[PDB]
C-alpha cells in the first residue's frame, strides 16, 4: 500500500504556526464528502494538540516549535470518515521525525573532578579522566561531539603547563617533569568541553590534581 | 484508498532545482527494497523530464520553473517495483496543479480599432467597443481582469475630451456636445488596458472614430 512517508521536521522552527506538513487524502472523496481526523501521542494524547488536521482539506498541521530532546519521533494515525458517519479507510500511520539542531552546550558530569598522581612519574603518564556529555545528535552531526581542552593551570610552578588532556577522551596526562609534592602539592586546572568537536559552544569545569608523595 | 493530494506549484519558481515536491512510499519497503518510477506527460512523454522521481527515496522532483499558460495541470502515475522486478502496487495518480502569477500584460485584439458616430447624438451615446484579453487567471485573481481607460484624444477640438470608455466593457461613448463633422471629422484616441482591474500592467492601442454627417 501507498502510504505517507515519514515527515522530517527540524526542531525549533520559526513557523508561522500552524504549519502545513502534508495533505492527507482519501480517494473516496469522489463519491462522498470526507472528514479527516488524527489520533496518537501529540494529537489526542499527551502532549495533546501538537499536531492537528484540518477536518475538510486533510492538511496535517504542526502547531508549535518542536524539541527533539523532548520527543524525537511521533507516531500518529490518520482517519477518514464520510459525512454519513462511516469510517471509509483503515487508519493510516504517520510518522513525524524531529531532526537536530545544536541547541545544547556540553555539560560536565561534575563541576569539580579530583584525581591524583605521584611525583616523578614519566612525562606521558595518565593522571585521571574527565567527562562532559552533550544532548544533541552525535551520529550524523558533531552537535553532540565534545572536544576537551585545558584553559589554564594554577599555580604556574614549576612550569606553566604540566598537564595536557586528550581531546576526545578527557584523559589528563603529565607532559612535564618537576612535579614535587613538597613545593606544589596540588593543582587546579580549568578544563573545557566544546561541542562541534571544537568549533562549537564551550562549557567550563575544574580538575584538582593531588601530587602524591 | 489513501492517495497523494494534488500538489499545488506556483509558476515561475526560483528553485533551486531539482525541487522536492512530495515523497512517494510503498508499505512493502518493509520486506523488500523498492524502486519508484513515474509515467505520464511531463515525465516519460512530452514534455519529457519536467518531473522525475528519485529511484530509491521516492522523492518526486520538479526539474524546472513551470508556466501555467503552457500547461496548467499534469497527471502522472507513480509506480513501485521490487528489487526482484515485480510491480508491488497499482500505479497511483498524481496531480500537479500549476497556479497563476500575473506574468501577462493585457493585449488588445487589434492595434487600431475603427468606429464611427453621428454628429449631434446626445451625450451618453455608445460609439463603439474595444477589447483586450489577458492570459492570466481572472477567476480567483484580478491577474486576468482588464480595466479600460482613455489616455488622450487628438485633436482637442472642440473640447479636450469628448469621449469616455466604460472601464470593464471597453464600450466608448460620447460624453459631450459639439461633434461637428465639418470642423473635426475624425478623432484618434489612445486607449489603455490595465490588468489587476486597474492596479497592474498597462497596454496601449488606438481607436479612430469617424464623425458621420
Ligand atoms: Ca532542543
Ligand atoms: Ca538539539
Ligand atoms: Ca551541542
Ligand atoms: Ca506564465
Ligand atoms: Ca500567469
Ligand atoms: Ca495579466
Swiss-Prot record, chains A, B:
Task: Give the top-rank taxon of the lineage listed in the UniProt record for this protein.
Answer: Eukaryota
Residues forming the Cadherin domain are 1-108, 109-213
- Coiled-coil regions listed: none
This protein's major location comes to membrane
Q: Which residues are glycosylated?
A: 93
Q: Name one GO cellular component term.
A: cell junction
Q: Name one GO biological process term.
A: calcium-dependent cell-cell adhesion via plasma membrane cell adhesion molecules
Q: In which tissues is it expressed?
A: Expressed in some normal epithelial tissues and in some carcinoma cell lines.
GO MF annotation, one: beta-catenin binding
Q: Respond yes or no to whether keyword Transferase is given for this record.
A: no
Which residues pair up as cystines? none
The protein's location, in the record's own words, is: Cell membrane
Keywords (alphabetical) are:
Calcium, Cell adhesion, Cell membrane, Cleavage on pair of basic residues, Disease variant, Ectodermal dysplasia, Glycoprotein, Hypotrichosis, Membrane, Metal-binding, Repeat, Sensory transduction, Signal, Transmembrane, Transmembrane helix, Vision
Q: How does it assemble?
A: Interacts with CDCP1 and CTNNB1.
Free-text note on domains in this protein's UniProt record: Three calcium ions are usually bound at the interface of each cadherin domain and rigidify the connections, imparting a strong curvature to the full-length ectodomain.
Q: What does this protein do?
A: Cadherins are calcium-dependent cell adhesion proteins. They preferentially interact with themselves in a homophilic manner in connecting cells; cadherins may thus contribute to the sorting of heterogeneous cell types.
Task: Report the disease annotation for this entry.
Answer: Hypotrichosis congenital with juvenile macular dystrophy: A disorder characterized by congenital hypotrichosis, early hair loss, and severe degenerative changes of the retinal macula that culminate in blindness during the second to third decade of life. Ectodermal dysplasia, ectrodactyly, and macular dystrophy syndrome: A form of ectodermal dysplasia, a heterogeneous group of disorders due to abnormal development of two or more ectodermal structures. It is an autosomal recessive condition characterized by features of ectodermal dysplasia such as sparse eyebrows and scalp hair, and selective tooth agenesis associated with macular dystrophy and ectrodactyly.
What is this protein's record name?
Cadherin-3
Gene designation per UniProt: CDH3
